[PDB]
Structure 1
C-alpha cells in the first residue's frame, strides 16, 4: 500500500555525470563511452547569449578550452562537435561506468526522473512530467544546466531530457539528448515564456485508478459517459482531450478495478464540477497529473531494475 511520486533508481546515471567548464561557465555533462554531452550554451558569455551564432562561437574554441572533470579526475577533450543544441565533447577516456542506454524523445504527458546535479555532482532525484506546454516543473538552481532526465526499462537507461534554462514563471525548458528542444524555445537570450498549460487527463485518470487500488473510492459513482461528452467537459476545465488511445492504455487498470474508463470519466467530471468537498485522494486536495498509466501499473506491481 501507499502511493508516492517515485523516481527510477539513479545509480546508472550518477556514474555518467561530469563537470564541464568553458571560460567562466561551469555546468554538467553526461559522459557516455568517449563522449561528454552538454548544453551548447556552455560556449557562450553574458553578451554572447544575446545574438549567439553558435557555429561562430564554437569555431573559436580549441579542445583544451573545455575542462571536463569526472570526480577528482580531469578528462582530456580530443574533439568537439555540435548536434542541434547539444555539444558533444570527444574525450580520451571511455566511461567505464557507461550503462546500457538509448536516447529517446518523449511526448507531453510522459514522466521521467531528473537527477539534479551541480558541478558534476548529483544532488537529488525527482520525478516530473513533460507538460502539454513542453515545460517541466522542475527544481533547479543556477549551475543545474546539463542535468538529465531519464527512464529505465529493464537494464537500459532511456535518456530523454537535458536541462538548458529556466523561464520567467520558474518552470524549465530543455532538449532531448539529440539537442532538439522540447517546445518552442531557443538557447538564445530573447523574450520567452511558458504558454498556457493544460492538465494531462489520461494521467489524472491513471491516478484515480491508483487511488481506487489503494482503497480511496469515495469519488466513484454509478454513472458513465461517452468520450465526446467527456471531452466537451475536459475542454471547459483546461484538461487535455482524451483519445481512444488513452482509453485503450487505461484498459488494464479498468479491468483490475472493474471501473470502465468512461465510468472513471464520469467520476472525473463530477470532481471537476463539484470539487473534492473537503476530501483528499491519495493525500492530495488537487487532481494529480504526473503519474502515467504505466507508472501506476509499475508502482502497484513492484517492477525492478
Structure 2
C-alpha cells in the first residue's frame, strides 16, 4: 500500500556523469561509449550569453579547449561537433559503465526521473512531469546544467532530457538528447516566458484509479458523463480536454477497478465543481497530475483492494 512520486534507481546514470570545462565555465556532461554530450552554452562566458552566435563561438575552439573530467580521471577530447543545442565531444576512452540506452523525445504529460548533478557529481534524484507548456518544475541551482532526465525499462536507460535553463517563474527548460528544446525556448539569456500551463487530465484520472486500486472510493458517484459535457467542465477549470485516445489508454486501469472511464470522469467533474470537502485522496488534498497511467500500473498492486 501507499503511493509516492517514485524515481527510477539512478545508478546506471550516475556512472555516466562527468564534468566539462571550457574556459571558466564548468557544467555536467553525459558520457556514453566514446562521446560526451553537454549543453553547448558551456562555450559561453557570461558576456556571450545574451546574444551568442554558437557557430562563431565554436569555430574559435579546438579539441583541447575542452576539459572533461570523469571522477578524478581526465579524459582527452579528440573531436567535437554541435548538434542543435548540444555539443558532442568525442573522447579517447569508452565509458566502461555505459548502460544499454536509447535517446527518446518524451511527450507533454509524460514523466521521468531527474538526476540533479553539480561538477559532474550527482547530488539528488526526483521524479517530474513534462508540463503541457513544455517546462518542468525541477529543483536546480547554478552548475546544474547538463543534468539529465530519464526512464528505465528493464535495464535500458531511455534518456529524454538535459537541463539548460531556468525561466522567470522558477520553472525549467531543456532539450532532448539530440539537443532540440522542448517548447519554444532558445539557449540565450533573452526575455522568454513559459506559456500558460494546464492540468494533465489523463494523469489526474490515472491517479484517481490508483486511489481505488489502493482501497478508496469516497469520491465516486452514481453519475456518468459524455466526453463533451466533461470537456465543458475541463475548460472552465483549465484541464486539458479529454480525448477518446485518453479514454482508450485508461482501459486497463478501468478494467482492474470495474469503473468505466466516463463514470470516473463524472467523479472528477464532481470533485472539480464541489472541491474535496476537507478530505484527501492518496494522502493529498489536491488533485495530483504528475502520475501517468503507466506510473500507476508500475507502482500499484495488480490486485485491487476491493
TM-score band, normalised by shorter chain: over 0.9
Compute the displacement of 1:175 (Å).
0.2
The alpha-carbon deviation at position 6 of structure 1 amounts to 0.4
The aligned counterpart of 2:79 is: 79
Cα deviation for residue 235 of structure 1 reads 1.0
Q: What TM-score, normalized to structure 2?
A: 0.98
Whether the aligned pair in 2 keeps the contact of 1:154 and 1:304 (CA below 8 Å) is: no
| Aligned partners of 2:103 and 2:177 also within 8 Å | yes
- Superposition deviation, residue 179 in structure 1: 0.4
> 3-state SS of the aligned residue for 1:263?
helix
User: Structure 2 vs 1, CA of residues 187 and 246 (structure 1 numbering), >3 Å: closer, same or farther?
Assistant: same
Which runs of 5 or more residues in structure 1 are unaligned? none
Runs of 4+ in 1 over 2 A off after TM superposition: 301-305
Residue 303 of structure 1 deviates from its aligned partner by 14
Question: Post-superposition shift, 1:176?
Answer: 0.2
Cα distance, 1:302 vs structure 2: 8.4
TM-score with structure 1 setting the length: 0.98
Q: How many residues get paired?
A: 305
Q: Is the Cα–Cα contact under 8 Å of residues 20 and 29 in structure 1 kept in the other structure?
A: yes
Residue 304 of structure 1 deviates from its aligned partner by 20
Distance 1:42 1:198, change over 3 A: same
Residue 138 to residue 303, structure 1, CA distance change in 2 (3 Å) = farther
- Separation of aligned partners in 2, 1:304 and 1:283: 18
Residue 181 (str. 1) matches residue 181 (str. 2) = yes
Q: Could you say if the C-alpha distance between residues 68 and 304 of structure 1 is closer, same or farther in structure 2, counting changes exceeding 3 Å?
A: farther
Deviation at 1:222, TM superposition (A): 1.0
Which deviates more from structure 2 when the two are superposed, residues 127-136 or residues 278-287? 278-287
Q: Is the Cα contact below 8 Å between 1:113 and 1:150 reproduced in 2?
A: yes
Contact 1:19 1:26 in 2 (8 A): yes
Distance 2:216 2:303 in 1: 23
Residues 8 and 113 in structure 1, CA contact (< 8 A), matched pair in contact too: yes
Spell out, residue by residue over 1:60-91, the C-alpha distance to the aligned partner (whole angstroms, 9 max, x if none): 01111111110110101111000000110000
What residue in structure 1 maps to residue 284 of structure 2? 284
Deviations 1:216-240 (A, max 9, x none): 2110111111111111111111101
**Secondary structure in 2 matching 1:49:** coil
How far does the alpha carbon of each residue in 1:101-157 deviate from its partner, in whole angstroms, 9 at most, with x for none? Answer: 000001100000000000101101100000000000001111000000000111111
- SS of the residue 1:203 aligns to: helix
What do the CA deviations read for 1:16-63 (whole angstroms, capped 9, x no partner)?
A: 000111111111000000000000010011111111110100000111
Unaligned stretches of 5+ in structure 2?
none
Deviation at 1:301, TM superposition (A): 4.5
User: Are the aligned partners of 2:110 and 2:292 in contact in 1 as well (CA < 8 Å)?
Assistant: yes
Alpha carbons 2:213, 2:304 under 8 Å: kept: no
